[model samples]
Target chain A: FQAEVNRMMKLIINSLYKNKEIFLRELISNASDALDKIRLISLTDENALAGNEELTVKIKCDKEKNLLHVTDTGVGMTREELVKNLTSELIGQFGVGFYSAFLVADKVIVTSKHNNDTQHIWESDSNEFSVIADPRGNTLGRGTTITLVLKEEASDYLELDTIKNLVKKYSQFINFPIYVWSSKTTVWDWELMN
Target chain B: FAFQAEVNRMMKLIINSLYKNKEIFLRELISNASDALDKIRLISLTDENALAGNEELTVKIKCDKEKNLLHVTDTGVGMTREELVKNLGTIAKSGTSEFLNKMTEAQEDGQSTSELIGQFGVGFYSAFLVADKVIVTSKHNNDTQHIWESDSNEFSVIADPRGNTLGRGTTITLVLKEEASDYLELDTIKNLVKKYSQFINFPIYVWSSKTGKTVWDWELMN
Candidate 1:
């Protein structure tokens, strides 16, 4: 599967997913899907959203580290789900949002926690991904956060303004509210961009 | 350029070389059903959800005289729409049965004659020996139910408008020729099942005519 994954990454990086800015749109849309799944599950099981009922997508950029984050309070993935859906076998069936992260970043780290399972970290360096129990002890409680370590030339994605504009252009009609972290003259707070 | 193709020449060779009993069509259909049933059971051993619906592993046979149809159904791993086209499209697509040539050579060396019937994936094609038309309806776990219908010349597959009638199996209906009326009799079908498939692993049920084709108990043949 890693051989297939490596071939697909080369194809995606060089060929089809060359338009790098759409990576933001793709990641947010996938985040919305995870949120939808958790919301649907919560409709039946009231305790499904016991600690975290807020359904939203949050984006924060750490310019110093050249990293961008997309967090969502959605149906997070289990270790099994991460390994199953994130391979070349399901490349065509699934939208290439997760794979598209590679367009702007050389490395990707995903921290996810379902309601019933322990939080796990899935990390990859464009060639292979491995899942391990998160040492941070479930800060998410119920959701997922994806971190993209941007390429040196792709460091423009760490700009908050670029992310906000991309969300407005592609995700204007998304059902859930989208928040982007910003500082209004030292008063740093999360602003609802949507 | 216009394409020119035909299977009637090879189909003639297959038909002409066949043994005297056309009744062997029932045996071929049953053996194919048994194999498919065996497939689904083996799949269920690994994936519990494989048998999500129609869990019973049985082969059923029924004849509707009014409709001139004989149906052999099995709770097997059924064909998807594409598989139906390829499996039933035996003669046209699968030309030059090199595997079959070996089976014929082996048959001359006193291998069981039944070997000749199933070779070249033409076991299902043998249904044409007695029927004027054949309709195969199948449903696999991965795909919706679909129907493949043909009259030996050409065939087409379509989504079963009946909507998953056989939830996880295949039902093959042979519209018998007018001269092949004896197949509509319960006794003939029973004797055919007894002779060919009595020792087969799974239970086979033939619709009994004791109560005049009403909803009577399906008589278990083996």
Candidate 2:
């Protein structure tokens, strides 16, 4: 079992992160995939997105802190869902998406709140992860937020411009709207400035 | 196990015989070629050397009514021998479920219908709806030119005897069934191109005999 786990880890790290920029694409793909699941569910339930109705991916980059956060208003995982879905046994069977965070981040934090369950936090280094109940009350009504503490080499991913370009390149054609929290500067004539 | 087998049976039935329009076979092939072109173009953005040969990306169609053959050729990334076997030989064994589920969900959402049809996973098998024999000649940059031929169920691949005809691309030829003769008409072929593939990123051309062929040839054609 130990040997098999090691082999699977190698496969996940190598195959999924063959290109570093691919991790962003993979994460958005997973986010879109989660959205798809909820969309399919809503076909019957009609209230699947009851908490936060809009289905979208929102991104924020903190250059000062060298961190990037991606949040999706999609299907949030319950406590049991986290344990099952994060485990290699399940992720390996379905996809190697969540673990792709390791390609750029030295540490990863995931805060998720599901409709049926209280908020929870799952944190990980490349090797292992820990899951615990969120000390803070329900933050997201229903969805997931993944925070990446960037590695020194990956600090470039923390720039708002960089993140926006990456999202446009990889996730522009995705079904759901993707937005980045950003601001633009404007130049004015001397009289207009006055 | 029984449930799994039942699902398999249903999937097989859906893939083998579900698509009704015979013209969609050409559409599927062109969409797949467009995808190949997109992939190579993306790779070329990061790696300048990707489009070393055959920089022109286009799809060309030619029909030989006398021989009952229709050929679709694309200047795009071709497949290796193994990829050819895995992609074509296995048919709907890969990606068909995801494709089906996405289609069903999109239909439920009332998404544009034409957008869903271009994704060429099991859509490639729609060729069998109109053809008894299909031949694929591909030339990948990493591998030599190869020809893969299939009679629906079984397929075989061999190094092409007329080698290196395509510098880097794929050419698919279909042996037209008797009832599918309208596919050979130049006007029908042109209309199909304009209707389905007009917006494709790559230039698409249809071979025409409109120029310099009148008295004897046109009369013989008549």
Best by DockQ: 2
For candidate 1, write residues B7-27 as lDDT tens digits.
Answer: 222333333233347787888
Quality class of the docking in candidate 1, CAPRI style: incorrect
lDDT tens string, model 2, B175-217? Answer: 9878789998988987887777865887888877544454211
Clashing pairs in 2: none
Per lDDT, the best of the predicted structures is 1
Off by over 4 Å in 2: A1-17, A87-96, A186-194, B1-222
Q: TM-scores of the first chain across all predictions?
A: 0.87, 0.81
Listed per model in order, the count of residue pairs whose N, CA or C atoms clash below 3 Å is: 0, 0
Model 1 clash pairs? none
User: Pairing residues by index, what is the TM-score of model 1?
Assistant: 0.45
